[PDB]
Amino acid sequence: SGKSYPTVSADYQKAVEKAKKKLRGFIAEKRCAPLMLRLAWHSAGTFDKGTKTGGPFGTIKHPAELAHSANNGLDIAVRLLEPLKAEFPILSYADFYQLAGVVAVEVTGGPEVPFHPGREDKPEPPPEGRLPDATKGSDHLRDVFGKAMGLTDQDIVALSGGHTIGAAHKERSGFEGPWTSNPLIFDNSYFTELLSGEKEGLLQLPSDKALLSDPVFRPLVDKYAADEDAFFADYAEAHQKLSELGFADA
Ligand code: HEM
Ligand SMILES: N=NC(=O)c1ccncc1
Ligand SMILES: N=NC(=O)c1ccncc1
Ligand code: NA
């Protein structure tokens, strides 16, 4: 809604389709879907609606943005994708990284998030510090996702479900371990685990726990824990919106 997607050439479209297939095989084989989802999300999550700066515009590959503390370990993601990207010189890094994120969700069994090409690679990384802090709560989440990015409370909860794949690493954030028993499977288990309480071997961040106590977030957690179809629907909506922040006006 509110989007006017740019025209791209037939050759650009062909490259998107071929890159999508190549990314599926590569991501599946390398077992790096969670990292690629994090790479897409950190690329997009810096958008500030009031100034129209940051967002999914290829800047995460810049040494300067990779250096941001929130981006610990994402230099691995960038390196892993570089040989593949070089096979698709016509694609923007901006598009390529968002496409990797969409593919990461698909190959782990998640919803098919619609993808529209045309993001341009912008020269200037956003300032550091826009991404959310795992030790903070619901107010902070609204500041970051709502006031800056311009996403809804529904989007916040659905997107938090992205933690249904992958893990924290004590050498990256300092937190450690997977949120779920199946960290390469995209499903609603993140909310199931969040509701059941702490379990040995499984992670919950203070930012995850903040969803349980908020009057608006909690009914959504409950909905998603009960109804994976509803989760997949709202997830696909939120991921699309996230991937298109500042793109296509909008
Ligand atoms: C709600 C605010 C969020 C906070 C505070 C947060 C925080 C974190 C932290 C601390 C890690 C661990 C990094 C590491 O140590 O390796 C992590 C990993 C991850 N995040 Fe989030 N995150 C948030 C939202 C999101 C969103 C919106 C998505 C995507 C939709 C997402 C997807 C992921 C994935 C897939 C991983 C695992 C990466 C891997 O396995 O290497 N997160 N997040
Ligand atoms: N960050 N860990 C990974 O996902 C990974 C890193 C290097 N090669 C394959 C996978
Ligand atoms: N808020 N947590 C993060 O996103 C993060 C912080 C430090 N290193 C990696 C990830
Ligand atoms: Na899972």
CSV table of N, CA, C and O in Angstrom, one decimal, residues 152-162 190-191 211 216-222 224 231 235:
chain,number,residue,atom,x,y,z
A,152,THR,N,4.0,-1.2,12.0
A,152,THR,CA,2.9,-1.3,13.0
A,152,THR,C,3.3,-2.2,14.2
A,152,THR,O,4.3,-2.9,14.1
A,153,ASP,N,2.5,-2.1,15.3
A,153,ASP,CA,2.6,-3.1,16.4
A,153,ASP,C,2.5,-4.5,15.9
A,153,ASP,O,3.2,-5.4,16.4
A,154,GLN,N,1.6,-4.8,15.0
A,154,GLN,CA,1.5,-6.1,14.4
A,154,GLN,C,2.8,-6.5,13.7
A,154,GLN,O,3.3,-7.6,14.0
A,155,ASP,N,3.3,-5.6,12.9
A,155,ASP,CA,4.6,-5.9,12.2
A,155,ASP,C,5.7,-6.2,13.2
A,155,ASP,O,6.5,-7.1,13.0
A,156,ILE,N,5.8,-5.5,14.4
A,156,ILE,CA,6.8,-5.7,15.4
A,156,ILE,C,6.8,-7.2,15.9
A,156,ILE,O,7.8,-7.9,15.9
A,157,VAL,N,5.6,-7.7,16.2
A,157,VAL,CA,5.5,-9.0,16.8
A,157,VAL,C,5.8,-10.0,15.7
A,157,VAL,O,6.5,-11.0,15.9
A,158,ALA,N,5.1,-9.9,14.5
A,158,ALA,CA,5.3,-10.8,13.4
A,158,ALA,C,6.8,-10.9,13.1
A,158,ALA,O,7.4,-12.0,12.9
A,159,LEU,N,7.5,-9.8,12.9
A,159,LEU,CA,8.9,-9.8,12.6
A,159,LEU,C,9.8,-10.4,13.6
A,159,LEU,O,10.9,-11.0,13.3
A,160,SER,N,9.5,-10.2,14.9
A,160,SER,CA,10.2,-10.8,16.0
A,160,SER,C,10.2,-12.3,15.8
A,160,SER,O,11.2,-13.0,16.3
A,161,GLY,N,9.2,-12.9,15.2
A,161,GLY,CA,9.1,-14.3,14.8
A,161,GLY,C,10.2,-14.8,13.9
A,161,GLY,O,10.4,-16.0,13.7
A,162,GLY,N,10.9,-13.9,13.3
A,162,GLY,CA,12.1,-14.2,12.5
A,162,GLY,C,13.2,-14.9,13.3
A,162,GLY,O,14.0,-15.6,12.7
A,190,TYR,N,8.8,-20.1,17.6
A,190,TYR,CA,9.3,-18.9,18.4
A,190,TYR,C,8.3,-18.5,19.5
A,190,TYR,O,8.6,-18.3,20.6
A,191,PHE,N,7.0,-18.3,19.1
A,191,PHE,CA,6.0,-17.9,20.0
A,191,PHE,C,5.6,-19.0,21.0
A,191,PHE,O,5.3,-18.7,22.1
A,211,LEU,N,7.4,-8.7,24.5
A,211,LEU,CA,6.2,-9.0,23.8
A,211,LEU,C,5.1,-9.7,24.7
A,211,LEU,O,3.9,-9.5,24.5
A,216,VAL,N,-0.8,-4.8,23.8
A,216,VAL,CA,-1.0,-4.9,22.3
A,216,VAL,C,-0.2,-6.2,21.7
A,216,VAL,O,-0.8,-7.0,21.0
A,217,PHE,N,1.0,-6.3,22.1
A,217,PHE,CA,1.9,-7.4,21.6
A,217,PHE,C,1.4,-8.8,22.1
A,217,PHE,O,1.4,-9.7,21.3
A,218,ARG,N,1.0,-8.9,23.3
A,218,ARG,CA,0.6,-10.2,23.9
A,218,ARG,C,-0.5,-11.0,23.1
A,218,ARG,O,-0.3,-12.1,22.8
A,219,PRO,N,-1.6,-10.3,22.8
A,219,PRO,CA,-2.7,-11.0,22.0
A,219,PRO,C,-2.1,-11.5,20.6
A,219,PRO,O,-2.5,-12.5,20.1
A,220,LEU,N,-1.2,-10.7,20.0
A,220,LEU,CA,-0.5,-11.2,18.8
A,220,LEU,C,0.4,-12.4,19.0
A,220,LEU,O,0.3,-13.4,18.2
A,221,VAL,N,1.2,-12.4,20.0
A,221,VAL,CA,2.0,-13.6,20.4
A,221,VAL,C,1.0,-14.8,20.5
A,221,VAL,O,1.3,-15.9,20.0
A,222,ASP,N,-0.1,-14.6,21.2
A,222,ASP,CA,-1.0,-15.7,21.5
A,222,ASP,C,-1.6,-16.2,20.1
A,222,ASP,O,-1.8,-17.4,19.9
A,224,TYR,N,-0.4,-16.0,17.1
A,224,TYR,CA,0.6,-16.7,16.3
A,224,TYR,C,1.0,-18.1,16.8
A,224,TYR,O,1.2,-19.0,16.0
A,231,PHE,N,0.2,-16.4,11.5
A,231,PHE,CA,1.6,-15.9,11.6
A,231,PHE,C,2.3,-15.7,10.2
A,231,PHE,O,2.9,-14.7,10.0
A,235,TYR,N,3.5,-12.3,9.0
A,235,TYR,CA,5.0,-12.3,8.7
A,235,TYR,C,5.3,-11.8,7.3
A,235,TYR,O,6.1,-10.9,7.1
